[PDB]
Amino acid sequence: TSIGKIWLTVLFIFRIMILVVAAKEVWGDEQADFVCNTLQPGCKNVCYDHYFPISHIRLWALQLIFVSTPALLVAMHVAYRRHEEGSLWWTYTSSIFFRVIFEAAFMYVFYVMYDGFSMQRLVKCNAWPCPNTVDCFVSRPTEKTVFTVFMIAVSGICILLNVTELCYLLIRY
Amino acid sequence: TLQTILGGVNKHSTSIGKIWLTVLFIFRIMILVVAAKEVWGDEQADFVCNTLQPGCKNVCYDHYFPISHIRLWALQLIFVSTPALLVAMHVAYRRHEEGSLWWTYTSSIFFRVIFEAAFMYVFYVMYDGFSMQRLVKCNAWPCPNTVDCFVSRPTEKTVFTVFMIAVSGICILLNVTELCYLLIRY
Q1: Which of B2, B10, B149, B180 has the most CB within a 10 Å radius?
Q2: How many domains is chain B built from?
Q3: Which domain holds residue A172?
Q4: Residue A28 in 3-state DSSP?
Q5: Cβ A135–B62 below 8 Å, yes or no?
Q6: Cβ atoms of residues B72 and B164 within 8 Å
Q7: Is A28 annotated as a binding residue?
Q8: What is the DSSP letter of B40?
Q9: Is the Cβ–Cβ distance between B10 and B22 less than 8 Å?
Q10: Secondary structure (DSSP) of B98-150
Q11: Do B44 and A29 touch (CB under 8 A)?
């Protein structure tokens, strides 16, 4: 279909380019420029690890890998089978079903792990060994927000494109 | 081996689009990667503020550079290049299988004008002109009353800012003339 042939794969390269040429160096000094107002040794390590259990760019790297395997699998699978309708139709509809699942799953993780799509300048931390409560300051909170909003919006569009192609087939029956 | 990638998009082009638009495109790409990248390398490492307050440097840098210049140019290049990529993908595949091509083409050059005009507008409003300053005064929390902070390489960043803006302004003028020739023919 026009949407599947063009728009899906165009937006996919769109996400890859944003990740590799632009975003990857916004997050370069994420822990080098974390600053905490304390004299306690080790407070910076625990407080950074508490508020960033996994970095944003590495979630996107994982997400891109997962949503590309169903495309990569269906190509290899048919090639081997043809080396030696319902089957091909079943594989196609299933493949676009998994892609919707993966995109939905990862957008969910972003929301609940990071409490929204906006990054704060100041984080308050009280995990051991830090004393009562310590102020720590994030590096480049505004730029990281801009790319987060960009990446989420593109993913949301990809979900909408997939469901239309899915609806396009079920009505065809 | 980007010759084969460009060669396909080199065709399916008009007189000045086949030559002038594309050469200016590699012109901007080369400057971004070859030269301008090593200028903005230490934008935060060499930001210096005259204070003893922890965390004042982070908020002051983030307040005056909400998004770096190079990553605005990186985004701008990606956006204006997609209409070319779509035209090559959409048309060639159907050519494998006048007005339709005319409608798609004149539409594509309409989006390229919009993106470049939009991004130039952002540069003006966000950074208040095209000249970067040596000194910035910052009073966001947690900084005490008002703090002096100093920018790294202000003069070299101004030169490349002017250079990229001027080239973008030319690309707009080339696109507008391309529109006129197609429009006058009707």
Answers
A1: B149
A2: 1
A3: 1-173
A4: coil
A5: no
A6: no
A7: yes
A8: G
A9: yes
A10: -HHHHHHHHHHHHHHHHHHHHHHHHHHHHHTSS---SEEEE--TTS-S-EEEE
A11: yes
Evaluate whether B55 touches A2 at the Cβ level (below 8 Å).
Answer: no
Rounded CA separation A26/B37 (Å) = 13
B144: preceding bond cis by omega (within 30 degrees): no
- Residues of chain A positioned with their CB less than 8 A from the CB of B90: 6
Cα-trace Rg, chain B: 21
**Experimentally, how was this structure solved?**
cryo-EM
Q: Report the alpha-carbon distance of residue B97 to residue A106 in Å, rounded.
A: 38
Resolution value, angstrom units:
2.7
Closest CA to A7 of A160, A171, A167: A160
Q: Which residues of B13-42 are buried (b: 16+ CB within 10 A; e: fewer)?
A: beeebeeebbeebeebeebbeeebeebbee
A26, A33, A146 ranked by CB distance to B58: nearest: A33
* C-alpha distance across the termini of chain B, in Å: 39
Q: Which of B59, B66, B142 sits opposite A143 (nearest CB)?
A: B66
Of the candidates A124, A122, A114, the residue with the CA atom closest to the CA atom of residue A43: A124
C-alpha dist (Å) from residue B172 to A4, A124, B110, B114, B116: 32, 48, 10, 9, 7
Residue B83 corresponds to which tokens in the numbers above? 């209409």
CA A169 to chain centre: 28
The residues facing B148 across adjacent strands are B137
Q: What does the block give as tokens for B125?
A: 């409003």
* Rounded-to-integer distance, Cα A15 and Cα A156, Å: 12
**A137 CB-contact burial (10 Å; exposed 0-12 / middle 13-18 / buried 19+):** buried
For residues B107 and B176, what is the distance between their CA atoms, to the nearest angstrom?
Answer: 12
Residues B134 and B47: beta-carbon distance below 8 Å: no
Please identify which residue in the block is written with the tokens 């974390």: A34
Distance from CA of B169 to the nearest CA of A (A): 23
Amino acid type, A44: K
